[PDB]
C-alpha cells in the first residue's frame, strides 16, 4: 500500500542498467514475454479503443496515461483521458506487477488529445492539447492550439490549468504534446512538443535555411548533394500541411502547487532536429534524451542528447540505431536512406539500456514495428548503432501497431533487468486498437565466449 516502489526496485529505477564495455551490445536480448501485466485498463467498451499511451517512471513511482474512445477509433471522435499513478511491486514469489495508487478518467467535455505524462515528486504531470477541430484544419487555423497542464496527485486529486498559448505559442498555428513521456528535471517538467510555425513569424524566420542530413550506416544516398539538401529543406515543410514548417520543440514548466506555472518554450535549431514529430523526454541516470518519432525521411530511432540550462534546453547530435527502423510510406520506408519530404512513420521509442563506463549510450531496448511500410509486426529487441539482437515478436505478423513506449528497470534485489513495453495493438478481426503492457527480461548469452 506504500506510495512508492517496493524495496526490491529501490535503486533500480531510472539509472544506467548495464555498462558492459567488452561484450557486444546485441548479445543482450529480450526473453519470452513474461508476466503479462494488467495495470492498463482495457477499452471501456468492446467496440471502442484505448490509444496514445504515455508512460514515465521516477525512482518512487510511475505515471501512465491513455486516450479512450467509446465507439470506433477514429480521431474525429469524442474521447476520455485515463490518467494513473502507480508503483512497481513484487508478490511473495517475486512476481513483478504494476500497482496503481491512484487513477482518474477525465470523463468531462474537454477534448484532450496527444497527451503526455511525467512522474514528478508531486505526482503525475500531464500535458494535453484541447481542440474541437481537425488536425489538418489546426495547421490551417490562424491561432495556436490550446494546451493544458494537469496533475493527478498522490492524494488522488486532479488539477488542471489551461496555458496562455496565445503568447506561449504565438508563433504556432498548430502545437501538440509529443505523446511520449515527459521528464522531471531541476524542479521543472519537460515535455517534447511539435507543430506548425506561423509563416514569417520570429520562430519561423529563425529556422529559415536550417536543416540537417542524417545518413544511414553502410548505405549512402545515391542522390546528388544539390538534390539531397533540396529534399532535406523541404522535409520541414511537407505538402500535407501546406508549406507550414513542422517544428520540433521542448516545453519546460515549473512543478509546483500552481499548474502551468512559468512555461518556457525552447525551439532547438533545425540544424540539429529533423521535422517536428511526436517525441519523448526521458532521463536515464544523469543524461537526458529527446526521442523523436521518425515522421520524416529518417527511419532509424533518434535519441537526441538533451542538456538543461535553467528553464531552456539544448539538443545535440542524436544517437542513431540503424536496425531500430520504423515502417513508413515511400520514399520514407523503413529502408529509406535519402532525405525527402513526408509525414509518415510510427512512434516507437528506444529506452537507453546499455552504456559505456564513460556513460556514452551504447545500446537500447524498444518494440519496433518490423515492417517496411505498413504499421505492423511489433518486435522487442536490443539495438546498438547498427544491429539488433534476437527479437521477441509481440504477436503475429498481422498485428497492427500505432505506438510502443518502452521503459526498462532493474530489480536490484535479484539484479535482473526488465523492460516494460506498452503497445497500442490490434488484430484484423478482434476489434479496434487497445493498449497492452508487456514485460520482458533482458538476457545475455555467456556461453557464447
Ligand X SMILES: *[C@@H]1O[C@H](CO)[C@@H](O[C@@H]2O[C@H](CO)[C@@H](O)[C@H](O)[C@H]2NC(C)=O)[C@H](O)[C@H]1NC(C)=O
Ligand Y SMILES: *[C@@H]1O[C@H](CO)[C@@H](O)[C@H](O)[C@H]1NC(C)=O
List interacting residues with Ca ion (CB under 5 A): 138, 141, 174
What does the radius of gyration of the chain's CA atoms come to, in whole angstroms? 20
Exposure class string for 3-12: b at 16+ Cβ within 10 A, else e: eebbebbeeb
Q: Which of 12, 30, 43, 279 binds a second copy (CB under 8 A)?
A: 43
- CA–CA distance from 29 to each of 163, 211, 340, 384 (Å)? 43, 35, 33, 11
CB contact at 8 A, 151 and 125: yes
CB contact at 8 A, 45 and 71: yes
Nearest approach, Cβ of 387 to ligand Y (angstroms)? 7
**HEC profile for 209-251?**
CCCCCCCCCCCCCCCCHHHHHHHHHHHCCCHHHCCCCEEEEEE
Among 142, 145, 146, 179, which Cα is nearest to 162's? 146
Choose the stretch contacting ligand X; rule: CB under 6 A; options: 73-81, 182-190, 254-262, 355-363.
355-363
The label of the residue with cell 535553467 reads: 310
Cα separation, 219 vs 422, whole angstroms: 31
Cα separation, 68 vs 77, whole angstroms: 10
Nearest approach, Cβ of 132 to Ca ion (angstroms)? 9
Q: Which residues pair with 184 in a beta bridge?
A: 189
Cα separation, 31 vs 374, whole angstroms: 26
The reply to whether 46 sits near a second copy by the rule CB under 8 A is yes
Cα separation, 449 vs 443, whole angstroms: 15
Q: Which of 22, 36, 74, 224 binds a second copy (CB under 8 A)?
A: 36
Which of ligand Y, a second copy, ligand X, none does 425 bind, CB closer than 5 to 8 A by kind?
Answer: a second copy
Cα separation, 324 vs 278, whole angstroms: 17
Which of ligand Y, Ca ion, ligand X, none does 138 bind, CB closer than 5 to 8 A by kind?
Answer: Ca ion
Choose the stretch contacting a second copy; rule: CB under 8 A; options: 76-84, 93-101, 379-387, 389-397.
389-397
Which of ligand X, a second copy, ligand Y, none does 434 bind, CB closer than 5 to 8 A by kind?
Answer: a second copy
Which of ligand Y, a second copy, Ca ion, none does 344 bind, CB closer than 5 to 8 A by kind?
Answer: none
Neighbour count for residue 111 (Cβ, 10 Å): 15
Q: Which of 4, 10, 42, 443 binds a second copy (CB under 8 A)?
A: 42
The reply to whether 398 sits near a second copy by the rule CB under 8 A is yes
Q: Which of 107, 262, 356, 414 binds ligand X (CB under 6 A)?
A: 356
Choose the stretch contacting ligand X; rule: CB under 6 A; options: 62-70, 281-289, 352-360, 365-373.
352-360
**Residue 202 DSSP class:** H
Which of a second copy, ligand X, ligand Y, none does 218 bind, CB closer than 5 to 8 A by kind?
Answer: ligand Y
> Which residues in 214-243 contact ligand Y (CB under 6 A)?
218
> Which residues in 177-196 contact a second copy (CB under 8 A)?
none
CB contact at 8 A, 379 and 368: yes
Nearer to a second copy, 152 or 438 (CB): 438
The reply to whether 386 sits near ligand Y by the rule CB under 6 A is yes
The reply to whether 218 sits near ligand X by the rule CB under 6 A is no
Nearer to ligand Y, 218 or 286 (CB): 218
The reply to whether 50 sits near a second copy by the rule CB under 8 A is yes
Nearest approach, Cβ of 363 to ligand Y (angstroms)? 15
Which of Ca ion, ligand X, a second copy, none does 356 bind, CB closer than 5 to 8 A by kind?
Answer: ligand X
The reply to whether 358 sits near ligand X by the rule CB under 6 A is yes
The reply to whether 157 sits near a second copy by the rule CB under 8 A is no
Nearer to ligand Y, 24 or 170 (CB): 24
Choose the stretch contacting a second copy; rule: CB under 8 A; options: 38-46, 128-136, 297-305, 334-342.
38-46
> By CB neighbour count within 10 A (0-12 exposed, 13-18 middle, 19+ buried), where does 448 fall?
exposed
Nearest approach, Cβ of 272 to ligand Y (angstroms)? 25
The reply to whether 397 sits near ligand X by the rule CB under 6 A is no
Nearest approach, Cβ of 21 to ligand X (angstroms)? 7
Cα separation, 168 vs 151, whole angstroms: 20
Look up residue 410 and give its three cell numbers: 532493474
- CA–CA distance from 249 to each of 5, 117, 171, 281, 416 (Å)? 32, 16, 12, 11, 36
CB contact at 8 A, 128 and 113: yes
Residues in contact with ligand Y by CB under 6 A are 218, 386
Residues in contact with a second copy by CB under 8 A are 33, 36, 41-48, 50, 394-396, 398, 425-431, 434, 436, 438
Residues in contact with ligand X by CB under 6 A are 356, 358-360
Amino acid at each position: 500500500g506504500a506510495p512508492i516502489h517496493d524495496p526490491d526496485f529501490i535503486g533500480g529505477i531510472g539509472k544506467e542498467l548495464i555498462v558492459d564495455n567488452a561484450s557486444d551490445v546485441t548479445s543482450f536480448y529480450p526473453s519470452a514475454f513474461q508476466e503479462h501485466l494488467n495495470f492498463i485498463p482495457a477499452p471501456t467498451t468492446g467496440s471502442g479503443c484505448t490509444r496514445i499511451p504515455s508512460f514515465d517512471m521516477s525512482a518512487t513511482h510511475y505515471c501512465y496515461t491513455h486516450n479512450v474512445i467509446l465507439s470506433g477509433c477514429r480521431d474525429h471522435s469524442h474521447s476520455h483521458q485515463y490518467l494513473a499513478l502507480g508503483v512497481l511491486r513484487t508478490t511473495a514469489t517475486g512476481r513483478i506487477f504494476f500497482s496503481t495508487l491512484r487513477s482518474i478518467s477525465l470523463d468531462d467535455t474537454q477534448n484532450r488529445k496527444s497527451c503526455s505524462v511525467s512522474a514528478t515528486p508531486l505526482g503525475c504531470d500531464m500535458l494535453c492539447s484541447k481542440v474541437t477541430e481537425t488536425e489538418e484544419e489546426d495547421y490551417n487555423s490562424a491561432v495556436p492550439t490550446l494546451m493544458a497542464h494537469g496533475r493527478l496527485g498522490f492524494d488522488g486529486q486532479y488539477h488542471e490549468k489551461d496555458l496562455d498559448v496565445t503568447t506561449l505559442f504565438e508563433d504556432w498555428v498548430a502545437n501538440y504534446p509529443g505523446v511520449g513521456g515527459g521528464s522531471f528535471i531541476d524542479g521543472r517538467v519537460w515535455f517534447s512538443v511539435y507543430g506548425g510555425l506561423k509563416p514569417n513569424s520570429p520562430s519561423d524566420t529563425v529556422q529559415e535555411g536550417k536543416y540537417v542530413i542524417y545518413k544511414r550506416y553502410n548505405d549512402t544516398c545515391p542522390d546528388e548533394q544539390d538534390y539531397q539538401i533540396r529534399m532535406a529543406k523541404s522535409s520541414y515543410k511537407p505538402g500535407r500541411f501546406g508549406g507550414k514548417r513542422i517544428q520540433q520543440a521542448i516545453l519546460s514548466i515549473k512543478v509546483s502547487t500552481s499548474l502551468g506555472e512559468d512555461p518556457v518554450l525552447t525551439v532547438p535549431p533545425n540544424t540539429v532536429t529533423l521535422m517536428g514529430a511526436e517525441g519523448r523526454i526521458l532521463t536515464v541516470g544523469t543524461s537526458h534524451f529527446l526521442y523523436q518519432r521518425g515522421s520524416s525521411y529518417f527511419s532509424p530511432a533518434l535519441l537526441y542528447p538533451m542538456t538543461v540550462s535553467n528553464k531552456t534546453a539544448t539538443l545535440h547530435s542524436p544517437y542513431t540505431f540503424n536496425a531500430f527502423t520504423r515502417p513508413g510510406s515511400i520514399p520514407c520506408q523503413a529502408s529509406a536512406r535519402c532525405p525527402n519530404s513526408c509525414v509518415t512513420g510510427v512512434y516507437t521509442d528506444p529506452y537507453p539500456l546499455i552504456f559505456y563506463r564513460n556513460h556514452t549510450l551504447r545500446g537500447v531496448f524498444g518494440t519496433m514495428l518490423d515492417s517496411e511500410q505498413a504499421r505492423l509486426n511489433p518486435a522487442s529487441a536490443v539495438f546498438d548503432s547498427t544491429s539488433r539482437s534476437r527479437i521477441t515478436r509481440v504477436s503475429s505478423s498481422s498485428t497492427k501497431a500505432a505506438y510502443t513506449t518502452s521503459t526498462c528497470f532493474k530489480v536490484v534485489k535479484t539484479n535482473k533487468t526488465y523492460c516494460l513495453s506498452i503497445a497500442e495493438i490490434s488484430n484484423t478481426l478482434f476489434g479496434e486498437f487497445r493498449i497492452v503492457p508487456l514485460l520482458v527480461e533482458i538476457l545475455k548469452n555467456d556461453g557464447v565466449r
